[PDB]
Amino acid sequence: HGYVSAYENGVAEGRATLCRVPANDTNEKNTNCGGIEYEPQSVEGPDGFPETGPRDGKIASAENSLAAALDEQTADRWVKRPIQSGNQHFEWNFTANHITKDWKYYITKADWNPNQPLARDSFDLNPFCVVDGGMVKPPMRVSHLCNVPEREGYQVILAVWDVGDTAASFYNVIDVKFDGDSPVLPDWNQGGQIYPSQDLNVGDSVYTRVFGQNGENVSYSTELVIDSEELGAANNWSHALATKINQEQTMLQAGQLNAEGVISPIYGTNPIYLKQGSGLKNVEIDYKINEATGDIKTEMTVYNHHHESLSSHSAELSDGQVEAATMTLSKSEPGHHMLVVVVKDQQGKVIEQNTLDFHL
Amino acid sequence: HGYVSAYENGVAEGRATLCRVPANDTNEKNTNCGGIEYEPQSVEGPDGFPETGPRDGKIASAENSLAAALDEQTADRWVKRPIQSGNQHFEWNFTANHITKDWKYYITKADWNPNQPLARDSFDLNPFCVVDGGMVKPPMRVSHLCNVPEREGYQVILAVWDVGDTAASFYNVIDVKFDGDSPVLPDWNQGGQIYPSQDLNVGDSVYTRVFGQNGENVSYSTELVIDSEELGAANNWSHALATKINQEQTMLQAGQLNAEGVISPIYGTNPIYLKQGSGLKNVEIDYKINSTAPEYDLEVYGLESEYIIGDSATQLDLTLEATGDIKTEMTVYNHHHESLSSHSAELSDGQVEAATMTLSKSEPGHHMLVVVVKDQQGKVIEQNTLDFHLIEEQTPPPSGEYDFVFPEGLNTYTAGTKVLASDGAVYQCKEFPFSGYCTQWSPSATQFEPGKGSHWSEAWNKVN
Missing domain, CATH: 2.60.40.2550 (Immunoglobulin-like)
Structure with missing residues (x-):
């Protein structure tokens, strides 16, 4: 039992890892993961991937019901983590360091569709990195030197820990973002996030508290009234509040840097960006329960x-x-x-x- | 906005902090925190504690709806972080480094009751530490050296951040355990946890996977079968499993270290302990989803x-x-x-x-x-x-001998677009890469106008 981490030299956490453990340098977490968020070390399934093992569309959960939520695949469902091509270091952290056979790493095809369920067809099935475990136990933590191929944009890396004393492997998909050094929107900087933190009832509202040079300033505030039961769905008011902020404010914008680069509201966690040279420091969310x-x-x-x-x-x-x-x-x-x-x-x-x- | 953290010298994370950020060493987290698990920096309430402020029972949540779950108070509800008497580093981490009036720290009375909602009467209301903020902005992360009073067992510290430029204070209660020297079960170690991970249905089961010298060994396994609506509650089968584990095993016991150092099943997270020199080093949990599922x-x-x-x-x-x-x-x-x-x-x-x-x-x-x-x-x-x-809207078949009476439709002119000019003749928009000139017209810049503009010879050509 283990998972892909980034406590030492690991260049990016795994998807399940992020359901429980904030990212190294951004505090981001993944949302609505089901039971796997208590136990990111448990993404365990039949071995023999790719010829056998977890069937297509259950690669990200390894067919463990505990991790079924992970099998959803869309452009904006998952926290993505930046990466460069060439030599990178990938890290595994174990709670139970089984006699290990090998570790294998595959990356998505360059032109894969991030809105299709992950499948063998999504991946370059000739792994870009293989490490001999040598049928011995590993330490309670290791890292690996892998030659990450050249990709652009959103890609997925599949890390396959194949243990020696069972018929199972541990499968951790990794959500990576290939940014080629050229900084996207360098006069925008992240300053807060709209987490889908809870569902709201009709007659509630949700609003921003924008913190700048003179503390909070309500000229920058945005409020969204919850007036249908459908808008009370966490992922619905998150998106609508992001959209409304973008429409009503100009010094801050909400959403993710999509495939277009420019900030666009997604139907999960919406980061809030702050125009650089505008003086704003941080944005929080607050709620009125009526x-x-x-x-x-x-x-x-x-x-x-x-x-x-x-x-x-x-x-x-x-x-x-x-x-x-x-x-x-x-x-x-x-x-x-x-x-x-x-x-x-x-x-x-x-x-x-x-x-x-x-x-x- | 900010919260009590332990990313550096911090002696202990605050209760809400642990709802989102796993503990410094043990990797432990509180469970069932409600909305606050997404925004631990937001336990904000009326200031003026203790004369006024958050009323009794609503201290740990600061009366904030988002953090209502925090107000529950039992002997075994929360992760307890270990602490010593005397000087300790208390560490705040801010997302908005507000101008600060002061920080105050209260400890519970040595003989407080952990099954009564937290109340003014539960605390020594004379703060054991006070830091004058000076009405200036702290750095994004700060630490205060505080002389923690001597105590024993489960204690709650209340860290109050009183904000300078608002009527509010951030209240972060902290659950701590005073165990200095006096080793608690030194022949027993933690090896895993029964986190209440999910509700289960009838016919499901949940069981342990104990890992030692020779991999996993099913002789120590315990299995719980969910045979009742009630037992499917994530708290219930976590309790029943830890209880079964203790009946059938002896080299491992599940549950919280209580007041008498006795490993005892509780109704939230039940830690799993492994006897010294038994060989066992890790226990995981697994599930058989054999509840019958509709063909969705x-x-x-x-x-x-x-x-x-x-x-x-x-x-x-x-x-x-x-x-x-x-x-x-x-x-x-x-x-x-x-x-x-x-x-x-x-x-x-x-x-x-x-x-x-x-x-x-x-x-x-x-x-x-x-x-x-x-x-x-x-x-x-x-x-x-x-x-x-x-x-795109399919343009209808062509008809007649031109496409627009100039300047009509000016925006769409491309290579082959014929137009009727004001002189009565028909011109076509030149091909690549002159075709972009055809779109350039205004009543002031009248060039490229078929039959009138100084430079229409470029953009357009007459038809015969």
């Missing part, structure tokens, strides 16, 4: 004098329904005891924790 | 092969056939892979809904419709990309 009391997703736990768990009972009650609860202790011991009571809502967020006391 | 599918009708660029933005008039309970996402891209339209549609089984997508740009060439399909719980099931084109 027994069975209401609709509640509830929880409960029993504790004692020594602050220890005994029992648990959820109950995502309806409105007004006064339901009965049987909880039993897993240690009916005497003395100081506590009963926590969590009153969330039917969307998760915490409203009220009320602790009682009792003695057995 | 989506079908998109109404996509044309070609769409003629009209006056208004091009529109897709599609309808969707949904098999299984699904959530859909569709995105239109153009042949240079820029995004122009999207349609989220949380459908249900057999439902047939109308989609109408509008291209932010109606320009000619090859376009793709990306159709992404997930189930009621948002697991990606399949992606299909359908192709279509945009064609």
